[PDB]
Amino acid sequence: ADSSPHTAPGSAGRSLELGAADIQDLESFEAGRGALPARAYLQSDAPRLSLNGEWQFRLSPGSRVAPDDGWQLGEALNGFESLPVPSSWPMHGHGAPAYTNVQFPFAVEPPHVPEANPIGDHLVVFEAGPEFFPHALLRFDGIESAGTVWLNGVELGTTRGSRLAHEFDVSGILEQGENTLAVRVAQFSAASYVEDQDMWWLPGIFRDVTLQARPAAGIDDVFVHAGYDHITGEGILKVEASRGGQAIDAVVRVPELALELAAGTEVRVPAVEPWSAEVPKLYEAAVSAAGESVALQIGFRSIAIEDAQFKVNGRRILLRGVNRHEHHPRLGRVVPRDVVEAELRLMKQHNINAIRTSHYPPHPQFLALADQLGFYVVLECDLETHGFESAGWAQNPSDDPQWEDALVDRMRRTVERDKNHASVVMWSLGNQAGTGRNLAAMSRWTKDRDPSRPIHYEGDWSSEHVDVYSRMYASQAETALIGQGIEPALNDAALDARRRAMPFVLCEYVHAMGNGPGGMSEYQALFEKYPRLMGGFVWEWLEHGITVSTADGVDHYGYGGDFGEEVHDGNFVTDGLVDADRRPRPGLLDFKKVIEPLRIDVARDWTGFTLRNGQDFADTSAFSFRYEVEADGGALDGGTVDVAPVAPQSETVVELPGSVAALAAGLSDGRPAVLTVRAVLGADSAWADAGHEVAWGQSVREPGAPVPPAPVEPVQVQDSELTLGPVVFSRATGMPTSIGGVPVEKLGLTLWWAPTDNDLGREWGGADERPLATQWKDAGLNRLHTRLLGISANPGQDGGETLTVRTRVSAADKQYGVLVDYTWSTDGETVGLRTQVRRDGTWVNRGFEVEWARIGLEFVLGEETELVSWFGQGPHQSYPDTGQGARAGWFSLPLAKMDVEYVRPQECGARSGSRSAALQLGGRTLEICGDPFALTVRPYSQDVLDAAAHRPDLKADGRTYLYVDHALRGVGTAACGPGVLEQYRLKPRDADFILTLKVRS
Amino acid sequence: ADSSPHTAPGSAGRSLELGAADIQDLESFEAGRGALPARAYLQSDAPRLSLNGEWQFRLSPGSRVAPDDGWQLGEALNGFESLPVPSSWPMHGHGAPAYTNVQFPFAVEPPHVPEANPIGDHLVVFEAGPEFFPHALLRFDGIESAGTVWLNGVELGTTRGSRLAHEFDVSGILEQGENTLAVRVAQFSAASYVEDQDMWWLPGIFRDVTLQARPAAGIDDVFVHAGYDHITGEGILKVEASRGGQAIDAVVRVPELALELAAGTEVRVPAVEPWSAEVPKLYEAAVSAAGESVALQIGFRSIAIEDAQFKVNGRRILLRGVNRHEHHPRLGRVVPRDVVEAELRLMKQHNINAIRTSHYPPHPQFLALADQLGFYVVLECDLETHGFESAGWAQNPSDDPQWEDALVDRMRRTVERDKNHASVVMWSLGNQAGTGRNLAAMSRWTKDRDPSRPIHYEGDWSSEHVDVYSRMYASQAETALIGQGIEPALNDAALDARRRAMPFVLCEYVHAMGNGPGGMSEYQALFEKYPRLMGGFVWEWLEHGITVSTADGVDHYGYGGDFGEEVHDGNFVTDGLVDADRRPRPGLLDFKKVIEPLRIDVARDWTGFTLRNGQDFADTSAFSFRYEVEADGGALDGGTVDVAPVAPQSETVVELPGSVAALAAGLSDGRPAVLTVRAVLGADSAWADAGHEVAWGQSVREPGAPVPPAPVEPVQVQDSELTLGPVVFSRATGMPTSIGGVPVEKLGLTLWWAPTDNDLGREWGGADERPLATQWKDAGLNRLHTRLLGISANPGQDGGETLTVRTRVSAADKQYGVLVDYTWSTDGETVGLRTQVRRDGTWVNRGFEVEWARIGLEFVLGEETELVSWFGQGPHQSYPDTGQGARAGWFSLPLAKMDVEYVRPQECGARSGSRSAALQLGGRTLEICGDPFALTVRPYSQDVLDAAAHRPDLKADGRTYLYVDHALRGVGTAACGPGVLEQYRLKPRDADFILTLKVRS
Ligand code: NA
Ligand code: NA
């Protein structure tokens, strides 16, 4: 209290504030107290009782008013109500979720906690039979953030490390019969300063609570060591077992390998089948002492770094990864097992082979599923101090000696829990925790304890205390330099030499927020080309949307700020490949294609395809290779082709049946036809059914360019309207008012789109750091207006005429514009529309050149569209730097399914590469043909889309908004990481393009 | 059409769009057509008929759909409805007002008009008797922006120059009996590009429409020349008269001067009383020909620039000015005469002596009122091209030869209308129109036509074509350099020499938006010290608020964007000294004091005062000098003192009656008493009643500093509360929960206030151009939180104790804080509160130091306050760099009258310099004493104030928000011009201060 300003004469007086002792504990730097030693999560035959279920719960707003009313004895519970456990309690109407990204939601003065600090008191009465005596423990697999535990009124201890397990000995405290377990949980504690992950703040007892008997002569911990010698094919096996901190005699049995060996001895198993994400071979094993048996699944694999490559079982691997948080839209950090199983299958179904547990250990039962389904796992300790960065990392716990014991404890618990799982191929120290002596201490502890797994940590770019060089969101350009080993040197020659000898991983890349991510293919090409590049993990698997309801009961996802937060980061928590209910976003469909493990390159003459097996261990024997030829009328040919199995990293040429090329050779010129070759699962796997598609390639015979009609109809002039065949025009605006009877409310040029999440991010570098969306607003691109310059008819053919409508498009207060001429022609059935765009003045504003979203047309039609059909790419959306998963073909969707249900509505739903489109408007069909154009159809305007913050803000107005774009820009990943690559940016230019239109009934 | 991209084979076709001819006319560079020569507005005995009244009106959205249906004959009017004329038609439910500041509301491509261009068709039937034959004309004193006029179906011509007069000969077209006048008015035209004033866009026939007979042998124009020779006292008189463009014989009679002379001859009048704003002497005159007589008011004055000074009648003058727009909150640009008369009286009542007609000629009848009441007028031509600045002035009309005739026409009409008025002392070419050849042409035309008045134009800083050096919002520092003649040189030595020989005027300064303007006194000191400084004109006289009603019928003022504008500038149109209904803002009350024309410096020993007459021409004989001594109980002494008249620019010492000093000498030490000496009007003037206050000065005997109580009561400790005499504290928060029975909901430190309009402006210069409001938001200053560190009692006196509550104030995600200790003491009746503030960490955020709004306390009391009384300054608000008009005294106001009704609610209502305050809360009174503190009391929180965009957003919640500030920052003028001067900025510091509190009943 010396820094506090007042100085009082006399000796110090007594402290009168309430709650001083509770707050002193919450502000403790200690890693909790009273717990048993950290150990593995082990399946054992020891009796077990889950205490999950309906508990009693009372919430107080802070420690100083949290009652000390003997509630732990369970006799006075008038202020308590039912609450399920496990739970994140703000998901059940107690307080509210709060989202921050980097910023802490409390003043940064470690270790101190704010006065507003929700305290949740939990209580359950349970029965314990004789099998839990004399010895038993209570296990808590997660408490956010600070728990104090009592049993029958006796304090057992405290928990720190919110996603880490704690166990408490209850021998001599547990009683036969009824027992009362009480747990006081503080939302905030000193630990909050090291738990600043970009996710919802959610207090609770959010994982299992278990009573476990500890029979005499049992097994407390087990450490499986299961290596693979790829030269000899041998497994290298040693299973350590301990009780009470001492090595014990136990018997290890592995029936499938005909093994019975002693614990603690290393043996060579003459032939094992090694474990990989591709082939996750597991051997069932048991480790047995007199009083207890532990069941294990052993996968034999060895991890090595050599020649600047990350190798498993002697081979460089490619990580096709995602960052997986634990989130459920209605349960918070509680993820039901069926949801976990389904989402891991969904990952495999989209070609993912690797998971980073961003940024804390997962539920303990996740590891066995990863072992079984096959993922390379980066298992990350629960540590993130990101919010200290804004003060230059002043007071960062990672470098503060007072935090050493707490941070080493986090790493020890992380490592000990999950050390037996073959899927764990790297330990990660944490995320965005800066640099410091405590991270070094965590690394040293881990390397000493478990030298079998390399250490990962992105926060220290010098990589002094790690085994791989990790970065997040490094540009494609920088990744290419690193891939070639030619990045700039570190200042320290010794550190530079070490880091240049390290393989390189992107622990986060291609930020998948909203419409995006763009630029994935450019990273993937590098990963495949350069051995030092290990691959990357997309940020992130899921959107953390939280289900809410409007006043009328319309369900939608909420994000930061939807829960009254004073400080929050908005929709940055909805930044995934799937929504919170695990529905794919288009980015997942594109990603699947980008990382597909086979490359199928179909010959232009349709005689065959080149096949490259991009897997590391498996051949192609799991796949059936299918071909199909489709034309406008439907499939013309199809079947299967036998492919002799191609070894990993090998390539072959496969001949297709002669009927396919004969078909190609017979096609009329200009008739469209698509040959697709697909690799599907030949048989059910653990993660998908036979017929599931893994890879594909195509060859397309493109339709001929559209033929404008002969301009043989003349312009008929009336007082207020002009008629040209099936088109009627306003003489006041020059715009069509109907085409073939389809009412047209507006036709005009487009240059802008409703900003994506990426367009709301700053594009660092250069002198202009305004987000693109702000550049557009400042430039008036969202508020264009059109002036009519003139309308005239010109001589056509055989008495016909064309009609040229001259316009200029600009914005209020701007001098730059584009002259736009529309030239219309018709033979009475088809309409030709030529659009010519010429800049009039430099598109520069506030000293920076204005980029465009598009060069296109918006037709506003005075009727609703029922069905949208097109030839192009699909079925899902595609933009210049996305759409890898959109394949060539003929597609048809009801209008509602053209949209994409991003949580914050934004530009989406364009189908790039379209050659023809057909919109069904009641009883008429409007057909559009062009050289490649992008197609979008919506039931609301761009201004409605831009203004909407949530999906219920969208409303259909009875019209159809049809967008036909001659040019589009890419979407990039500027919300976090690279913006649109140069080749996909759209700079102002002069342009012309032709469309043909037809209305049939 | 060559720039338009499409190229069509064959010869060009016929134009098919509608409205081409109307739009061609609107896009014309010509100054209108068909009008009679520009001339003076003259009062004549020729028969006159006002056609103002109920007309018929039809609105179309643009020229292309404006009907050409013979409506001008008045036979088919089914689409017409009644509309008063004169009117701004969007004030009557036709379309909507639209506010832009600089930005044009249409694409900038001169001379072209947008498609959305409201067309208002006006029609009236009137009767003309025989007195209007054979010759008559129709006069239009204002049409915004483009009128086409028909009478009985015959086109008379067109109008351009929205605030300029046009007359059309109707001889041979007017018929005896009924006539039909039709006027098509376009909102936008090529003229809009030269009418970009910062004000509402309001189309209409917004000034008088008059039929005037033109008898034979009449007088068409008159040019009065009336100079004054200050050496001899002579007037120099020549009155020119013309008819049909030729000089005529006419007789000039000036009865009061015993004159009968011929028009066109210069005479010397041996003794005249000269005209000035202080003494606006006017002589009634008549100029008569056989068929017509013109009545004139002649003021004799000569204007000269010599020795870098602007002189009238041989003396340097001081301009105490405002910029006057024409605006009415319900009628738009129509200002009723009674409103004009009242507002000019109000100006005189606040010591104003000068008006700039920003930025167009006023109603023609304004000039005679200015002549009569006495203002120096800067009469400004209707020209402003400000919106071209954002493109580097590309295409600026001022430098485009095609606009020469139009711009010279504007200046000619401006000069000719008002050239006879003594009040006009400068012609201004326009405002914010850049630089160019057409401005030079306007200046040359004016100097040739009327060399009697200097030319003003701020837009060309080289001053090549003007006679005074004018700037807007130059800093006090730059003004001081200019005042001393030591500003940097222009590159051209010849231009630099000319400009250094010019007097200097601020045509706009001390931008008066919202809470402000600060910094007025620093300008005024310079104006008074340096002869080259002519003075300045405040921006601006009035707020252009427009009266609107909420859903429930609550009237309030609207501003930009409240009328659906796509592009607008928000509340920048509400930036005046008075609201739209001419109610003073506090800035006017302060300004009155700043520019007061006498300086009264009261002696500290109360024996007398020094008096300086700061007028230029008048002595002090119009004033009665009053004194009063006031004490807590009321007035102790008062009366009048005879002052021998003090000449302009002279000073004297005036002895006060001995009773006043005897009173001062007898006062007990520490007893407060105030001596005020006032100069009031001794007799009714034309602009105020006898007793009206013009100037004042004070001497104050300050109350002694507060004496903290002896700390003889001890702290009583209860389970959840502490009691210390009359104060009860929470043991959970350390805050008082009641003081003497007054409920206290919260007590805490304040550092922030709800941003003023100035705080929302950028502070140019330095690397940080964020507005202060944004700096505060980024720093979290608007979201402070308090942590309780401890509560302890310490030994007091004779068994009593003090209570120290230690806290820390910070914001989420920030490391900087302030330690705040509160030390409480009491003797059972009075409470002492010592607050000590110490910074803990540097208040720096995003690399820039964080400034504070205040260092103070917020008491939130759980009851409503009825009445607020204080000793300090008042009655109105005062901040460190404002409050000049707040005088020392005792004040008492109901709570509602403490607030200030700014249109956008914002920080306001602080009373700086307070020594004691008393709040009546039901049956209790809370009394506060301190060394100088600022006092604010509100019925809603700062967050409610900040969130409110209009006054109906404010809501009382049943509490009292009491602010006691030990330190406050100034408010400056950063919305446009200088921010807070260094001496009034509030940087983070350590501070301590003492208050005493008492509750009586
Ligand atoms: Na322990
Ligand atoms: Na690689």
Ligand code: NA
């Ligand atoms: Na995120």
Ligand code: NA
């Ligand atoms: Na086969």
Ligand code: NA
């Ligand atoms: Na594609």
Ligand code: NA
């Ligand atoms: Na939106």
Ligand code: NA
């Ligand atoms: Na004329």
Ligand code: NA
């Ligand atoms: Na002066």
Ligand code: NA
């Ligand atoms: Na303004």
Ligand code: NA
């Ligand atoms: Na007198």
Ligand code: NA
């Ligand atoms: Na004052």
Ligand code: NA
């Ligand atoms: Na406000």
